[PDB]
């Protein structure tokens, strides 16, 4: 049962004694009164509960355990139960509160002194029990009393948040969602999509700050100072010279297609605006502000329970009539779906490995069924996972497919058919996927019988066979498979991974079989040409000239863009590829969850609109502008962004930057991506004393001439021979230097080509995006916390309306301080951690939400501070998220996961007062020839320069 029940008169009543007890725990007291504790009942209980005698008795019991962690744990638990029992017996008047208090202390002692060590944390705690200092600290009467209080306080806060969400959704005006068991899941799904949508909005505002060259101010506000600045921006010739105009147009080009728009109008109402460079930039920026500004103050607030309803409301206010420039760009990019696929084909070396006749055989065949984006539902595997599983399934067999730059082109070719042609047909008919289920199931049963009886436990598809009969559609079984994943994950973290693996393992098998069969029925004879990759220089050149003939099929109307979809376009076009993917997956999860529901609203639009948004996301990704340069552009932003990272002068290193064009011409693809991210301003100040392009790396690349010889004594003079030599041994110390030389060669080429710097730039944006997500979780939690406090008369002088003004006006930190005064401010501050006080960690939300780390000014400290900038944010963020646990300690857990993804390791040390300091960032150790014969060769996954320059970013100011 849900611990709260929604009444007919608008109130909410606890559904259990524990719920009411946790609801009534908090009772604010003003500093004028003697009471300074917001939880006086806890004070009375800790006065009753003598922890000194507990500590003394437990120490005496442990003294006879001879230091054995298991014996110590048993002694503590028996003495615990004894002491709890006489405390219960001699205290009859307060038994109800004591019940929950012994529940809390038992939970604490079970967490710290685990009886059962089937989990890693329990084993680590038992190992820590060996240290005398650790046992002495854990036995402290006080420390052990404060932690018991904190566990009770955290439960009270979390139960109060549940009150806020139920009132905000199911009791606001007319009960938008009927109260039921499924209510909690529906609210979580609605909140998840909104926060991600809000997260994408904050990333777009950074670009507006970048374009206007304006900071420390709300660019989206309509007050007289800021509004006047934007209206006359880039208009006055006296203040904004033509060179200033050129710089702004260059930044906008990386995101919006401007040269294409100007060319189209010249070939052919709004021509006067576009023909002038000054007016085109001014008008386009203003329309983005109007769409983003109203989008910011619509996702939250209460007239729109769903994100879709918030989009319709903005569409009515912001019509396409004043969005004329946005409409023109939308129509151009939708119409330019011919070139978009043409450059996509060339980008993956497709025409430089295959002839035109075979390429036209697949794509252009009496009208193609290549759709831009299928309505593929959640859990459908991506191409990469199925391809890796396909070869592994072939590995044991070594079907007719999944056979083995040559392999890169084959993977790229098979990706295009999978995601553009195979999936839409799977959506139409499900017999391709559902019909192949039995073949996978029968194969695994034979595998199980091939093992010993002692190893045949936990058959992989045992549960799947129970769920599966003959007749359900793919989606229905897909819902069934997802149903088992969600239900089991709530039971145990250990079994969640072991049972999410068996579900996904079957998922990879079933899709591979259908993909193989589908290819036979459609191509048949072009098979042997597919895996016959032939290099051809002249083939690529003709495809570049003769292009823009391949066609795609979309459901988007070609004449009238819809009102709601047009609002999203400035937000989507101002995001990077990493952010676009994250938002797209949320709509897939949102739409899929909606389908399983049977709510009494008939929907019929949320499902339809969500599919439209996903298709629009794919269109934006394909039509990404690709301006090479305009001759002078090289002697511009591109030049004044990397000269400080290169030793000597650009006159040197001429051989490396003037190689064959291929896919990396005189302009580096990485060098263009670094500028687009907008972080080069930060790196010119932080990583200034780290030369990315050195002479030592250049000398090693050009003058190759290794002393190494082959197995026959012949010298190696090219990396191609060594790679063949390295792979030849793959299929003693002589090959020690062979792979070491290649690894040292790779580090030089990665440093010179700026591929090492781009790795950090992707790494840096992953850290920032996670911190923005933490802020969104905190902001929505405080909204529901204050909402419940206003109800049932817990806050004073704060009416219902004032809370909505704090979180829906701007500068939440400022309004929260002003509105909450005296008792309320003290009551609100009783949930966080005073670990190192500071009394200013609430101000880190502005630093994260506004993305101050993406600017030169944001990378600065104060006189008092000593820890580095990255170390500074972590401490405040941990304090900010200290209102509840898990999230507080997830700041460093996700940071380690992100570094793990890049094959790097980071370590943190606990200082005095709980402050965390970065000790070192060490590279991983990838092993080749593992286990086989000699001990596995250990080599770092990254070079010396990459680790050193990554270290400086993490500790910019100092240690």
DSSP per residue, 645-695: GBSS-TTSSHHHHTS--TTS-SS-HHHHHHHHHT-HHHHHHHSTT--SB-H
| Element housing 323 (H / E) | none
Q: CA 414 to CA 402: how far, in whole Å?
A: 10
Contacts from 113-117 at CB under 8 Å and sequence distance 24+? 113/72, 113/73, 113/76, 113/77, 114/73, 115/73, 115/74, 115/77
Give 22: exposed, middle or buried? Use CB within 10 Å, 0-12, 13-18, 19+. Answer: buried
Torsion angle (degrees, nearest 10) of CA 146, 152, 154, 160 = -150
Classify burial at 513, counting beta carbons within 10 Å of its beta carbon; exposed 0-12, middle 13-18, buried 19 or more: buried
CA-wise closest residue to 909 among 959, 953, 951, 860: 959
Resolution in A: 3.5
| 8 Å CB contact between 4 and 163 | yes
Distance in angstroms (rounded) separating the CA atoms of residues 396 and 278: 64
Written as six digits, the tokens of 652 are 């040197």
Task: Compute how many other C-beta atoms are within 10 angstroms of the C-beta atom of residue 386.
Answer: 22
Two tokens, residue 831:
């949930």
* Burial tier of 658 (Cβ tally within 10 Å: 0-12, 13-18, 19+): exposed
The residues, any chain, with a CB within 8 Å of residue 710's CB and separated by 6 or more, are 716, 721, 725
Q: Domain map of the chain by residue range?
A: 4-179, 185-338+556-622, 355-533, 641-756, 757-954
Q: How far apart are CA 27 and CA 4, in angstroms?
A: 20
Q: Is the dihedral of CA 45, 46, 52, 54 positive or negative?
A: positive
Return d(Cα 162, Cα 183) in angstroms, integer: 11
Element (H, E) at 355: none
Chain centroid to CA 835: how far? 29
Which phi-psi region, left, alpha or beta, contains residue 662 (left: φ > 0; alpha: ψ -120 to 50)? left
The Cα–Cα gap between 812 and 778 comes to 12
Which technique was the structure solved with, according to the deposited record? cryo-EM
Torsion sign across C-alpha atoms 176, 182, 184, 186:
negative
Quote the CA–CA distance of 945 and 753 in Å, as a whole number. 13
């Amino acid at each position: 049962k849900i611990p709260l029940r929604i009444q007919e008169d608008g109130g909410i009543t606890p559904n259990n004694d524990r719920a009411a007890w946790l609801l009534g725990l908090m009772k604010p007291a003003d500093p004028a009164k003697g009471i300074t504790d917001c939880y006086p009942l806890l004070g009375e209980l800790e006065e009753v509960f003598d922890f000194d005698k507990l500590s003394k008795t437990l120490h005496e019991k442990i003294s006879r355990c001879q230091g054995r962690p298991r014996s110590i744990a048993m002694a503590v638990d028996e003495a615990l139960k004894q002491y709890l029992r006489e405390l219960w017996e001699k205290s009859p008047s307060r038994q109800q509160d004591l019940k929950y208090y012994f529940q809390a202390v038992q939970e604490y002692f079970k967490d710290n002194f685990p009886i059962r060590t089937k989990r890693m944390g329990a084993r680590l705690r038992q190992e820590l029990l060996k240290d005398k200092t650790s046992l002495s600290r854990l036995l402290e009467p006080k420390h052990m009393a404060n932690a018991v209080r904190r566990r009770l306080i955290n439960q009270s806060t979390q139960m109060h948040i549940l009150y806020g969400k139920l009132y905000a959704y199911c009791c606001g005006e007319d009960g938008r969602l009927l109260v039921n068991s499924e209510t909690l899941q529906r609210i979580q799904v609605h909140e998840a999509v909104k926060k991600q949508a809000m997260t994408a909005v904050l990333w777009s505002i950074s670009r507006l700050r970048y374009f206007y060259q304006f900071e420390d101010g709300d660019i989206l506000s309509n007050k007289n100072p800021i509004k006047d600045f934007r209206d006359k921006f880039l208009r006055d010739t006296n203040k904004y010279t033509h060179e200033d105009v050129e710089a702004c147009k260059e930044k906008l080009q990386d995101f919006f297609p401007l040269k294409e728009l100007q060319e189209k109008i010249k070939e052919d109402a709004i021509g006067h605006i576009v023909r002038d460079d000054r007016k085109l930039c001014n008008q386009l920026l203003a329309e983005c502000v109007s769409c983003i500004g109203e989008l910011r103050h619509h996702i939250f607030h209460y007239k729109n329970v769903t994100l879709i309803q918030a989009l319709k409301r903005i569409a009515d206010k912001v019509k396409p009539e004043d969005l004329s420039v946005l409409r023109a760009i939308y129509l151009l990019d939708r119409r330019n779906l011919k070139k978009a696929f043409a450059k996509r084909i060339s980008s993956m070396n497709l025409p430089l490995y295959y002839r035109e006749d075979l390429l036209s055989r697949i794509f252009k065949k009496e009208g193609t069924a290549f759709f831009l984006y299928s309505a593929k539902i959640q859990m459908t595997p991506s191409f990469q996972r199925v391809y890796e599983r396909g070869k592994n399934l072939r590995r044991e067999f070594e079907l007719k497919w999944f056979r083995q730059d040559a392999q890169r082109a084959l993977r790229n070719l098979l990706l295009l058919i999978y995601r553009h042609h195979f999936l839409p047909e799977v959506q139409k008919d499900e017999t391709l996927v559902t019909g192949k289920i039995h073949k996978v199931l029968e194969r695994n049963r034979q595998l199980s019988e091939g093992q010993g009886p002692n190893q045949g436990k936990a058959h992989g598809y045992s549960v799947i066979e129970e769920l599966y009969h003959e007749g359900m559609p793919l989606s229905d079984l897909m819902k069934q498979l997802q149903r088992r994943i969600s239900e089991t994950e709530r039971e145990s973290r250990e079994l969640a991974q072991e049972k999410t693996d068996y579900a996904q393992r079957f998922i990879l098998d079933i899709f591979a079989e259908a993909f193989n069969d589908f290819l036979e029925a459609h191509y048949g004879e072009e098979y042997l040409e597919i895996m016959s990759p032939r290099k051809d220089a002249e083939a690529a050149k003709k495809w570049v000239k003769e292009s823009k003939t391949v066609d795609l099929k979309t459901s988007i109307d070609e004449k009238e863009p819809e009102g709601h979809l047009l609002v999203l376009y400035p937000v989507l076009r101002l995001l990077d590829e990493r952010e676009l993917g994250e938002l797209q997956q949320q709509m897939i999860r949102y739409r899929t969850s909606l389908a399983s529901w049977q709510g009494e609203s008939n929907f019929s639009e949320e499902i339809r609109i969500a599919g439209q948004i996903e298709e629009l996301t794919e269109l934006v990704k394909l039509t990404e502008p690709e301006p090479q340069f305009a001759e002078e552009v090289w002697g511009k932003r591109a030049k004044e962004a990397f000269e400080d990272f290169i030793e000597g002068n650009m006159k040197n290193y001429e051989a490396f930057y003037l190689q064959s064009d291929n896919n990396t011409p005189v302009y580096r693809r990485n060098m263009s991506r670094l500028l687009r991210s907008g972080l080069m301003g930060v790196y010119q100040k932080v990583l200034a004393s780290h030369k990315q392009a050195l002479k030592r790396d250049y000398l090693l690349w050009s003058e190759k001439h290794w002393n190494v010889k082959d197995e026959n004594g012949a010298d190696i003079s090219s990396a191609e021979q060594a790679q063949c030599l390295l792979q030849r041994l793959h299929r003693c110390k002589l090959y020690e230097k062979v792979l070491r030389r290649l690894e040292d060669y790779n580090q030089a080429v990665k440093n010179l080509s700026f591929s090492s710097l781009y790795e950090i730039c992707v790494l840096n944006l992953e850290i920032l995006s996670r911190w923005v997500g933490f802020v969104q979780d905190w902001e929505r939690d405080m909204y529901f916390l204050l909402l419940a406090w206003v109800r049932q008369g817990k806050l004073d002088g704060i009416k219902e309306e004032d809370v909505r003004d704090i979180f829906s006006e701007g500068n939440i930190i400022r309004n929260l301080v002003d509105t909450l005064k005296g008792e309320n401010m003290n009551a609100f501050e009783s949930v966080y951690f005073p670990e190192n006080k500071g009394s200013k960690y609430l101000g880190v939300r502005n630093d994260v939400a506004h993305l101050d780390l993406m600017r030169k000014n944001g990378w600065r400290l104060e006189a008092g501070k000593t820890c580095s900038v990255m170390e500074d944010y972590i401490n405040r963020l941990r304090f900010l998220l200290s209102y509840d646990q898990k999230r507080m300690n997830a700041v460093t857990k996700t940071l380690q996961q992100i570094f793990d993804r890049h094959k790097v390791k980071i370590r943190f040390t606990v200082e005095k007062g709980g402050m965390l300091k970065i000790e070192d960032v060490t590279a991983d150790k990838i092993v080749h020839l593992k286990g086989s014969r000699l001990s596995g060769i250990e080599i770092p996954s990254h070079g010396e320069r990459f680790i050193d320059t990554l270290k400086a970013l993490m500790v910019y100011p100092r240690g």
